[PDB]
Amino acid sequence: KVYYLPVTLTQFQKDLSEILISLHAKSFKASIIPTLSQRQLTYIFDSNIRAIANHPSLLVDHYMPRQLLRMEPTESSIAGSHKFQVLNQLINSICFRDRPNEVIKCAIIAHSIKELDLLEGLILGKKFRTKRLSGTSLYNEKHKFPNYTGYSKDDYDYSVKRNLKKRKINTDDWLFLATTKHLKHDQYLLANYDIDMIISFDPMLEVELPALQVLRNNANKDIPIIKLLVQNSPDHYLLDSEIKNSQEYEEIKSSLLYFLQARNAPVNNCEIDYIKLVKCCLEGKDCNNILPVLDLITSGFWQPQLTKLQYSSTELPLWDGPLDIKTYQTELMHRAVIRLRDIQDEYAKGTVPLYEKRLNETQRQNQLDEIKNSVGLTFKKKQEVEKSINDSEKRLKHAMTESTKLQNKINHLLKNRQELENFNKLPSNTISSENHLEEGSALADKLKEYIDKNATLFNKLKELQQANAEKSKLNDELRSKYQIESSKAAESAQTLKILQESMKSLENEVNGPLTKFSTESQNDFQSLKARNKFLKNYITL
């Protein structure tokens, strides 16, 4: 059983490969259509393309100082490549699987010592029992693979069995590391430790090997192999020539020509599930979640093009000339340096629109909130004036009853005057009646004042109701406008976040192991050493 996982590049590796194409395109075009020759040129071309595909920190012609490896987090480590992200996802899926008691063992195969050191730095602290079958290990722990005098002159010594209830035993899956070179130079390295699955970080393992035939023979079940596949690369072409069913120079040239043609390949796949995949792999069945892509179909590509940034406007000189090794190093160095300056300046200029967007957002939120407060206050005041309009209605009713009673007395005494006037015999009744009519007129003026005040109160109530009915519409309009702007605000925030990530990536690359010159190039602890149970949470025995 052999398997394949599609893996693609990241923006950083894309830009670095464009830089390399810029440095290598002209002589390659001349070829197809102690300085150096085209042979060593194409060799360095392919080797550096592969190195960039495998965690671009390997682009430098050096070794990691063997100290910073155990001093950087997994996030900053796997932020460079995508292969490391996929492999870390795979390892995490295999370590947190649903387990009775299984001590399943796995093997991991690299191509050289650089990649192996990077791996062992990535998988140092995890919950595994590891053994590096290649020399010069990194923090070797001693996990060994399987294959009371109380008195004088007496002898009891029950101590031994005592410890057989005290020693805690590990239950961590085994995981071995190896390189294909040392795997082919010797043999029998895998027939000793019965393993179940091999993860080949190299995609060209040449599946029929002696040291693997002995393993396929001695084992009981069928063993699955998992090769990480770069989606388009100078090795995927050959790997596809194998997937179906002198001359190395011509194969190299054809692969690199295909890589140049398919650099701008539009479509790559996604959506890889890991738990079902590791289940299928461990049980020994044909897995179907893996994608069957297998190839991509075939003047205009000799021109390198980087990723277009907002207001960047840069260019590439294409190096249409001869070269030499030290000139190669220096040229690549200053090209990376000028691109670094440009991306730095690019980051430091998108800061301004973010400021204004934040300010407008803050002001709009405060305006909304003040509007809500005003709405509440106005409704409260109207609710208060309600009971007053009710009592005013009561007073108006009282005044109207008084009016009716007074007009009835007016009519009665006026009829009495009508009696007493014809053939007069004048009493004081007309005087008293006139006095009563004057009282009626006075209280009529009073009631008129009161009904006027009632009408005024009514109009005030209605006007306040109108104001409260308008305020809510105002709030709703402001809410709608806010949401409309919020969409684009979130978009710009996310974009600048991603740009910060890419800038930090390039900075940390050129900061550490760096291209051959120092032209541009501890508290606070950014290198993960806030020491609370770090060294003692290494096993230290």
Binding site: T74, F96, R358, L359, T362, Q365, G376, N523, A530, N532
Partner: protein, 661 residues
């Protein structure tokens, strides 16, 4: 002036060359998470203009907190919008949206689909999804504002672990300690603390393996407990009100005996205040006695505080009296706990002034200040709090080691359940004494049992003379289990059986009454039994006496002159009888040996002359060191419990005989 005065004129020699100070705490700053996009999530005012009193979970909260900092010089951001160059005391930490992996580490896919779908519903759909869930509101703009808190918490905690800050304050909303891994609830959408903790444990297995989560918010952390129940890498300690169904959430999962499950047993702890109204004293007591030894024993690598200031003074939802200096003291202790690592995530708080002041004090302590002084260090915590804390220490001693041999619990092993089978070596002591008493009484004067059918009580509770339905006179001794006088060893708790002195004070009456040829009925209600954990001696005694009066005694043909004698608090059971039934027809008197216990307030429910008749026909002896009309003729006995019994025996029996004539 002096003569010591080193007089040597030469150039000295370097001995210890200058170096950078080997200090790992406070050359650094403190992290602060804040972003203006977290004010987006808000309710939808639907019913009517309830704008007067808004919803308690309000955006301005964040703002207010931030603003307070800007008024105390801790931040130099004038426009009150999130900028980078805060100052010399803090350092801004960027907030990014959490991805699908981190948010699916603890939650399930159906929850993610539900939320991401409600992102773009209509209006009435949002209204229905709001009114359906248990105290959760959804709005059109709720997806991004809910993804942001988890990302902020993860970023703050990562900054702490990697060593770019000292501690961190994550001023963050919506809250995140009520969301269960499959459903939302309690104003929460995504559980922030669980997501953060699981991502730290997964992405950093070389500096962090054990994490301690402390929840001092006054409600229970439902989701954050359910997420780490079967796990032994996260120790979850919580302090809250419980009240069994009234307070939110009101579920069995918040009880004080949910002490783990699976291989995660002994890695969960609840501390429940019985009654609301606690203050500084209770918190300081529970922190000095429980939280700190357990913390020092667990040896964590990271301490997260799911803080919430709805228990502060002047609040309305919490109803407590915690002051801004108590938060400082707790923060100080927790700083002492680990090697300094600390993340403070904000969950609660619904009164702007209280949360503002409390957050200011907490931030001051985080920056480097020492805490202030308490308003009153003479407070004397409530009794129920002390009893609950003792009950908690018992269980946690059965799991942890720092709570036995220091609290006198090394005597027995509480892993074996106290039972009557041969499965456990432990047995209850009450049954032995009751069996001995039954043996003696039966073989001497033929004392039969009386069955309390259809109840959950031991068979030999009520003992009685034979043919009790034909006894023309009945004495009823509702006594209580005796009191021992021995030297309890203080390291183990075991008593020395050679020097014990126990007297059966409730037997002399039984002997006296037999000579007068009167039927006797003895009851024995124990005191909480240590077995059911919800036993109430008052309620149970009340039940037994109401049962005995309604079922059996109320139909006896030749009944006359029933007396009552009470010893200990069980006498209350007698009181609640007379105050709830007309019993004056056959009852003559009532005697009580209250000892040092407080008086029994008799309240009636049928008539009011009951108080007069009870005052006329009662004798209630009491302690001479007591000093304390409806209580019924309290008497201050000379001698003193057993002393007043042995001395005033003659007067009591003489009064009883006179009342009987």
């Amino acid at each position: 002036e002096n003569s010591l005065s080193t007089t040597s004129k030469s150039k000295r020699q370097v001995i210890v060359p200058v170096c950078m100070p080997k200090i790992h705490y406070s050359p650094l700053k403190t992290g602060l998470c804040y972003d203006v996009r977290m004010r987006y999530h808000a309710k939808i005012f639907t019913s009517y203009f309830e704008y007067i009193d808004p919803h308690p979970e309000d955006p301005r909260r964040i703002y207010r907190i931030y603003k307070i900092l800007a008024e105390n010089g801790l931040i130099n951001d004038p426009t009150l919008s999130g900028v980078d160059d805060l100052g010399d005391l803090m350092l801004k930490i960027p907030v990014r949206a959490a991805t699908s992996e981190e948010i699916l580490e603890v939650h399930t896919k159906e929850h993610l689909e539900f939320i991401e779908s409600t992102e773009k519903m209509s209006r009435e759909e949002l209204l229905k999804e709001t009114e359906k869930g248990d105290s959760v509101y959804f709005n059109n703009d709720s997806y991004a504002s809910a993804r942001l808190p988890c990302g902020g918490a993860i970023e703050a905690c990562k900054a702490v672990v990697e060593g770019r800050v000292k501690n961190s304050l994550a001023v963050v909303r919506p809250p995140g300690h009520h969301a269960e891994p499959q459903a939302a609830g309690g104003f929460c959408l995504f559980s922030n603390v669980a997501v953060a903790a699981k991502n730290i444990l997964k992405n950093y297995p070389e500096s962090v393996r054990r994490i301690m989560i402390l929840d001092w918010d006054i409600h229970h952390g439902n989701g954050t407990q359910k997420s780490f129940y079967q796990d032994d890498q996260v120790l979850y300690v919580s302090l809250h009100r419980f009240e069994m169904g009234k307070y939110y959430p009101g579920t069995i999962q918040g009880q004080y005996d949910q002490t783990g499950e699976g291989k995660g047993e002994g890695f969960n702890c609840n501390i429940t205040w019985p009654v609301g109204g606690v203050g500084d004293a209770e918190y300081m007591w529970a922190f000095e006695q429980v939280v700190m030894p357990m913390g020092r024993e667990f040896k964590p690598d990271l301490v997260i505080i799911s803080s919430g200031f709805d228990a502060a003074d002047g609040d309305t939802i919490g109803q407590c009296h915690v002051t801004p200096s108590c938060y400082g003291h707790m923060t100080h202790m927790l700083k002492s706990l680990a090697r300094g690592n600390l993340c403070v995530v904000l969950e609660g708080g619904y009164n702007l002034d209280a949360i503002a002041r409390s957050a200011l004090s907490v931030a001051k302590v985080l920056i480097g200040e020492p805490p202030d002084e308490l308003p009153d260090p003479l407070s004397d915590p409530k009794p129920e709090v002390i009893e609950m804390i003792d009950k908690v220490i018992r269980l946690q001693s059965k799991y942890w080691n720092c709570f036995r041999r220091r609290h006198a619990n090394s005597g027995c092993n509480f892993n074996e359940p106290i039972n009557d089978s041969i499965i456990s070596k432990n047995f209850p002591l009450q049954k032995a004494i009751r069996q001995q008493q039954q043996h003696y009484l039966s073989d001497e004067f033929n004392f039969v049992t009386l069955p309390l059918v259809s109840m959950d009580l031991p068979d030999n509770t009520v003992l009685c003379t034979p043919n009790i339905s034909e006894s023309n006179t009945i004495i009823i001794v509702v006594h209580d289990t005796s009191d021992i006088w021995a030297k309890r060893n203080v390291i183990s708790g075991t008593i020395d059986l050679s020097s014990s002195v126990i007297i059966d004070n409730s037997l002399d009456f039984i002997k006296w009454g037999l000579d007068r040829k009167y039927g006797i009925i003895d009851v024995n209600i124990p005191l909480t039994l240590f077995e059911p954990d919800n036993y109430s001696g008052m309620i149970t005694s009340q039940e037994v006496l109401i049962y005995l009066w309604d079922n059996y005694i109320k139909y006896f043909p030749s009944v006359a002159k029933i007396a009552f004698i009470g010893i200990g608090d069980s006498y209350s059971g007698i009181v609640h009888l007379l105050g709830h039934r007309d019993t004056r027809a056959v009852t003559k008197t009532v005697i009580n040996f209250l000892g040092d216990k407080q008086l029994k307030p008799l309240v009636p429910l049928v008539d009011e002359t009951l108080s007069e008749w009870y005052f006329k026909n009662s004798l209630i002896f009491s302690n001479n060191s007591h000093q304390c009309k409806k209580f019924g003729r309290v008497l201050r006995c000379d001698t003193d419990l057993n002393n007043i019994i042995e001395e005033r025996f003659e007067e009591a029996t003489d009064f009883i005989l006179d009342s009987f004539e």
